């Protein structure tokens, strides 16, 4: 029943989209980060400054220790915990309970951060990333096996107020127009092949291997669009070339002052569109996902004011090109593990004041790009 899963996420890009879960007997309720960039299901198992509650194993009659521990490191942050299994109910999705592996965290560094509302994480990537090894079955593989659902899930983020995680397929009411699919290049992270980036209709002129040199991945657990240093610099250079920033004048005399705007005025009309080309499942064809300034020049303030301050939602990476929440907020994203593909459709909830903040278009030809851009 996919309609019941509509709006089962809360949160925002900045600190995470999370799913409520009931764990153990009697049920303990937790708030769980949705992360397509890792493969472990782990919950706080002891108090922490930045969480309200944790999972207490001694209060669950169905919990079983598996007899070993585990440590997981992310690009930033890490934790160590014990490994067992227990019954989980997802109230907004599956009213039957299923048995899953669970890591109960007792130590962490730079993981539970101030401002979060989640106390656990749902790693939705492939078994090859799971710790201590790929034989520790993932949450979603247990689910597929036990609820006998299709090996597919899909995500819509409505923060451009929550979103939806549809486990087992696609929900038609969550998109408009066509789904475009790009092949999964390597089943670990959700690695896809990027052919080209275009800023205000001008392609960057980098070898396409630059976009993938490490890997290009789709990751709901990352807030920003994260670009390898060379790619980042080429982007911001193109953005400076295509933007039309106001000149300094009365009341505007430093660059910092560009951040905040009054009187319903916004910075968006001054900035170019940003497009990512992906190979289609038909190798000779590509499609383009496009974000408008509305998605990468991001409003910051709490409610109740009559000015707004914005931040740039693109940052450099050392290694990976990470399609994080900055971009995912523009699209309904389909993780079609059964057919080794990732799908994108424009989100209806990705609208500000009636207007679309993202676009999808194709096909384009791949005739002038290498047959493989992943080195």
């Amino acid at each position, epitope marked *: 029943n996919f309609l019941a899963m509509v709006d089962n996420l809360q949160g925002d890009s900045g600190r995470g989209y999370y799913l409520e879960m009931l764990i153990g007997t009697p049920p303990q309720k937790l708030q769980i980060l949705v992360d397509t960039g890792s493969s472990n299901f782990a919950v706080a198992g002891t108090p922490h400054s930045y969480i309200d509650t944790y999972f207490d194993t001694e209060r669950s009659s169905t919990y079983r220790s598996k007899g070993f521990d585990v440590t997981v490191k992310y690009t930033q942050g890490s934790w160590t915990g014990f490994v067992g299994e227990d019954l989980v109910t997802i109230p907004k999705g599956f009213n039957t309970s299923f048995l899953v592996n669970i890591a109960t965290i007792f130590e962490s560094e730079n993981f539970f951060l101030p401002g979060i509302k989640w106390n656990g994480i749902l790693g939705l990537a492939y078994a090859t990333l799971a710790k201590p090894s790929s034989s520790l079955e993932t949450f979603f593989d247990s689910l597929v096996t036990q609820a006998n659902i299709p090996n597919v899930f899909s995500m819509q983020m409505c923060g451009a107020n929550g979103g939806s995680l549809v486990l087992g397929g696609i929900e038609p009411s969550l998109y408009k127009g066509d789904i475009w699919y790009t092949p999964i290049k390597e089943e670990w992270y959700y690695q896809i092949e990027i052919l080209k980036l275009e800023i205000g209709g001008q392609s960057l002129n980098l070898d396409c291997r630059e976009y993938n040199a490490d890997k290009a991945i789709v990751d709901s657990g990352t807030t920003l669009l994260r670009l390898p240093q060379k790619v980042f610099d080429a982007v*911001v250079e193109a953005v*400076a070339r295509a933007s039309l920033i106001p000149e300094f004048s009365d009341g505007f005399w430093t660059g910092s002052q560009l951040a905040c705007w009054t009187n319903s005025e916004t910075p968006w009309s001054y900035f170019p569109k940003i497009s990512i080309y992906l190979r289609d499942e038909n190798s000779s064809r590509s499609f383009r996902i496009t974000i408008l300034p509305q998605l990468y020049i991001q409003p910051m303030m709490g409610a109740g004011l009559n000015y707004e301050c914005y931040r740039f939602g693109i940052s450099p990476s050392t290694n990976a090109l990470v399609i994080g929440a900055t971009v995912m907020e523009g699209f309904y994203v389909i993780f079609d593990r059964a057919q080794k593909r990732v799908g994108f459709a424009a989100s209806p909830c990705a609208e500000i004041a009636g207007a679309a903040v993202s676009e999808i278009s194709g096909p384009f030809s791949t005739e002038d790009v290498a047959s493989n851009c992943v080195p």
Partner: antibody
Amino acid sequence: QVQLKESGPVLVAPSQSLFISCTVSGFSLTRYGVHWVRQSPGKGLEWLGVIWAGGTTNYNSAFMSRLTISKDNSKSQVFLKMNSLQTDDTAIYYCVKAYRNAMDYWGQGTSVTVSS
Amino acid sequence: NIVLSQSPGSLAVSLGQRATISCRASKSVDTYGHSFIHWYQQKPGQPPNLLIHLASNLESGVPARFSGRGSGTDFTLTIDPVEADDAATYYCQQNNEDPWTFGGGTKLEIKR
């Protein structure tokens, strides 16, 4: 053709006051800000402040205690007045046209020496 | 104050070759992905003159031999190929925060 011309006292005694004018042509002060910058061997290039089209002034805080910039749109002139002169105020003083998010046309500069 | 530190203090480059000079800011100069820092050339007996606006935008009428790169705190100005007329001191200047400030300059010596 844009032009800026500083006129100042070539020599001024310490603790006395520095007054420099900037006469501009080829653009209007009703439309463009004018900045004051100085250059010395001891301190290099230092931005002193600016007067924008609408008459608003913003200053380098290190100098705000003793610097006043003003203008008279009808005379196409911008002015700089600095008090409590110290010998390291010896510098070349430029007026400079505002342009986008920086500065484009500079005057030739006027040499100011602070000495008794 | 945001401090700008330029290196090297002096560089000697042969005619026809590439010169690359660096500017380092004490704090990021970026807002909205734009770097509020600019490059100026000062020839002897002249005021400085803007070459590169917002880190990488070449000023109209400046030869294409001049180029600017960078983001955050690290910027470079590249002149390639260097010509005799390029003998001058180059300055970076930021205005992401007040006061606007200038780097200490880099003198390019043409190595004839």
